[PDB]
């Protein structure tokens, strides 16, 4: 369900990314678009996922299960109304203050004033999407409360489609061509909304928004939002300051980081969705029922699974950074220089894939423990270490150093959450990790050896059509995966 539609969305997101790279490359225009659209949406996502979504899903289901459909319709009406009012005000203030928002977020764009102007213009086109995508994600949250998961998963396909179409059709018309993306995004917003509204009507939860300050449920969802806003703020501030750092770097830095991060995202989302259906449900159940012993059992199996699957992915992405970048991005305005810079950023990002997967495996269980004080402390530490690693790595490695900083920060964040579990006896690993790690290390050595060998005997990656390059890429990915799994088979792990 989710596993099929959210990954169709994934190839279309990656296809739109390749289209962007092909048509606009990695430079001033693409830098401006990323700071203008991606950075505000990421702040918005952090806020909604960290505070609004966490508060909204329990209260909504609690209405749905303990009160009628009419009471739930009224709750949803007042929630969507207050959301729309706040976001309309927020959007209006943002379009007015856009030059100051770009100045604070990306100070270094001021050196090319025309680039700063495009970033401001694109934020003005972009900003209405915040409203649209928030309404669409509220729709999707409601539908998920009604156990309809495939529609909200498929919904971002419409954004990807809209952006691809705006690039292919509207870009030559638009006077700065990447302006077209904005409108695609805009159309995308509307489409993502329009697609989900009838399904909402299907469950009788499509209702005209309405404003009130007396609703008990609205104040409940406002109260559970409170303690999470400090951590949301930490994460937002860190991301803002990272962008500030990158803004002083050479044009394309933001775009190179973006492309590397998407390349690196690609398998990590697969693994995250897959472990979120194999492991997290049973972990949540074990924590809710108070079964400590078998919670440890799953925690250990899941951490071993993380080492078994995220490590080979990270190392393979590092070894295959040029194959991947050249085969998936190096067309049109994406030059060979852009490909090298993206390769470096991708090698840097590979360090933190492990930290990402483990943060997603450990963080469920703290929000369930209702311990937010120690994660907000961990988040402040992660901020401090991130900004410090930025100062340290920016001069020597530039954008790659900023990517290394983000990666190592994710590593330390996961490590600190694990240390909190270890100190409070929340988790203690099972015996036999040592020989298990040795098995991994041998299998990784075999995999990397086979990959290096093949690459020495395989053509220059720039040479060929996209069919040819992606065929070669898939051939080496297959040989590497096969060889890693064959080394593992000799060691053991015959069944899961």
Ligand X SMILES: CCCCCCCC/C=C/CCCCCCCC(=O)OC[C@H](O)CO
Q: Which residues bind ligand X (CB under 6 A)?
A: 11, 14-15, 18-19, 22, 40, 43-44, 47-48, 52-53, 83, 87, 94, 96-97, 99-100, 103, 110, 130, 134, 137-138, 141, 267, 303, 312-313, 316-317, 328, 331, 354-355, 358, 411, 414-415, 418, 429, 433, 473, 477, 480-481
For 458-468, b/e burial (b = at least 16 CB within 10 A) is eeebeeeeeee
- Residue 170 CA: distances (Å) to CA of 14, 124, 176, 177, 184: 20, 18, 11, 8, 9
Residue 43 or 153: which CB sits closer to ligand X?
Answer: 43
Shortest distance in whole angstroms from residue 113 CB to ligand X: 7
Residue 53 or 405: which CB sits closer to ligand X?
Answer: 53
Residues 6+ apart with CB under 8 A from 273: 2, 3, 6, 7
d(CA 277, CA 291): 20
- Residue pair 153/6 in contact (Cβ under 8 Å)? The answer is yes
Residue 212 or 471: which CB sits closer to ligand X?
Answer: 471
Q: Environment class of residue 435 by beta-carbon count within 10 Å: exposed (0-12), middle (13-18) or buried (19+)? A: exposed
Shortest distance in whole angstroms from residue 280 CB to ligand X: 16
Residue 219 or 289: which CB sits closer to ligand X?
Answer: 219
Q: Within 10 A of 147 (CB to CB), how many other CB atoms are there?
A: 8
Shortest distance in whole angstroms from residue 1 CB to ligand X: 20
Shortest distance in whole angstroms from residue 400 CB to ligand X: 15
Residue 86 or 194: which CB sits closer to ligand X?
Answer: 86
d(CA 448, CA 300): 26
Shortest distance in whole angstroms from residue 146 CB to ligand X: 15
Shortest distance in whole angstroms from residue 106 CB to ligand X: 11
Residue 187 or 473: which CB sits closer to ligand X?
Answer: 473
Shortest distance in whole angstroms from residue 216 CB to ligand X: 20
Greatest CA separation found in the chain? 71
Asked whether the CA dihedral 121, 122, 127, 132 is positive or negative, the reply is: positive
Shortest distance in whole angstroms from residue 138 CB to ligand X: 5
Backbone angles phi, psi at 225, to 5 degrees: -75, -30
Residue 262 or 399: which CB sits closer to ligand X?
Answer: 262
Q: Within 10 A of 316 (CB to CB), how many other CB atoms are there?
A: 22
Shortest distance in whole angstroms from residue 354 CB to ligand X: 4
d(CA 388, CA 393): 9
Long-range (24+ apart) CB contacts under 8 A made by 63-71 are 63/217, 64/145, 64/146, 69/204, 69/205
- Residue 304 CA: distances (Å) to CA of 299, 301, 411, 440, 446: 9, 5, 16, 10, 19
Structure tokens at 155: 């919904």
Name the residue with tokens 């959210």: 6
Asked whether the CA dihedral 216, 222, 226, 231 is positive or negative, the reply is: positive
Residue 76 or 83: which CB sits closer to ligand X?
Answer: 83
Shortest distance in whole angstroms from residue 398 CB to ligand X: 20
- Residue pair 262/329 in contact (Cβ under 8 Å)? The answer is no
Residue 54 or 282: which CB sits closer to ligand X?
Answer: 54
Shortest distance in whole angstroms from residue 324 CB to ligand X: 6
Residue 68 or 422: which CB sits closer to ligand X?
Answer: 422
Residue 18 or 326: which CB sits closer to ligand X?
Answer: 18
Shortest distance in whole angstroms from residue 301 CB to ligand X: 11
Residue 11 or 71: which CB sits closer to ligand X?
Answer: 11
Half-sphere exposure of 37 (CA within 13 A, CB side): 27
Shortest distance in whole angstroms from residue 489 CB to ligand X: 15
d(CA 284, CA 54): 15
Q: Give the residue from 220, 226, 203 showing the smallest Cα distance to 79.
A: 220
Sequential DSSP letters for 299-336? HHHHHHHHHHHHHHHHHHHHHTHHHHHHHHH-STT--H
Residue 158 or 450: which CB sits closer to ligand X?
Answer: 450
């Amino acid at each position: 369900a989710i596993s099929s539609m959210t990954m169709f969305s994934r190839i279309l997101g990656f296809i739109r990314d390749a289209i962007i790279a092909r048509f606009f490359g990695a430079g001033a225009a693409t830098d401006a678009f990323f700071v203008a659209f991606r950075l505000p949406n990421l702040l918005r996502r952090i806020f909604a996922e960290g505070a609004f979504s966490q508060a909204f899903v329990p209260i909504l289901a609690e209405y749905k299960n303990q009160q009628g459909d009419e009471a739930t319709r009224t709750f949803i009406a007042y929630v969507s109304g207050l959301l729309t009012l706040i976001l309309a005000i927020v959007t209006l203030a943002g379009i007015l203050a856009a030059p100051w928002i770009i100045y604070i977020t990306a100070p270094g764009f001021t050196d090319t004033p025309d680039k700063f102007d495009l970033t401001v213009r694109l934020l003005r086109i972009t900003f209405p999407y915040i409203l649209l995508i928030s309404l669409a994600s509220l729709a999707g949250a409601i539908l998920n409360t009604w156990n309809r998961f495939s529609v909200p998963a498929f919904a971002p396909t419409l954004l990807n489609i809209s952006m691809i179409i705006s690039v292919l059709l509207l870009a030559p018309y638009c006077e700065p061509p990447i302006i077209a993306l904005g409108w695609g995004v805009f159309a995308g917003g509307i489409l993502q909304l329009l697609y989900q509204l009838p399904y909402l009507q299907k469950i009788g939860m499509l209702v005209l928004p309405r404003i009130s300050f007396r609703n008990s449920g609205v104040w409940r969802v406002l109260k559970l939002m409170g303690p999470a806003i400090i951590g949301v703020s930490v994460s937002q501030i860190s991301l803002i300051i990272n962008t500030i750092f990158a803004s002083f770097l050479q044009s394309g830095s933001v775009s190179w980081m973006y492309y590397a991060d998407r390349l690196m995202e690609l398998p990590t989302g697969v693994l995250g969705v897959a472990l979120g259906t194999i492991l997290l449900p049973s972990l949540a159940k074990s924590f809710s029922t108070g079964d400590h012993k078998e919670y440890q059992r799953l925690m250990d199996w899941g951490l071993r699974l993380c080492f078994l699957l995220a490590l080979p992915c990270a190392i393979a992405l590092a070894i295959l950074a040029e194959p991947l970048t050249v085969s998936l991005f190096q067309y049109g305005n994406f030059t060979a220089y852009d490909a090298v810079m993206t390769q470096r950023a991708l090698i840097a990002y590979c360090v933190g894939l492990m930290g990402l997967i483990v943060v997603k495996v450990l963080a469920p269980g703290f929000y369930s423990r209702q311990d937010i004080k120690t994660p907000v402390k961990i988040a402040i530490i992660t901020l401090i270490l991130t900004q410090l690693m930025n100062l340290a790595f920016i001069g020597s490695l530039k954008h790659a150093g900023l990517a290394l900083s983000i990666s190592l920060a994710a590593c330390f964040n996961a490590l600190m959450l694990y240390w909190q579990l270890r100190r409070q006896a929340i988790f203690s690993p099972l015996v036999g990790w040592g020989k298990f790690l040795l098995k991994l290390i041998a299998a990784l050595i075999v995999m990397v050896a086979v990959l290096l060998l093949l690459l020495n005997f395989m053509p220059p990656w720039e040479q060929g059509n996209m069919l040819v390059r992606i065929t070669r890429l898939l051939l080496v990915v297959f040989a590497g995966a096969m060889s890693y799994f064959a080394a593992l088979f000799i060691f053991g792990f015959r069944l899961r």
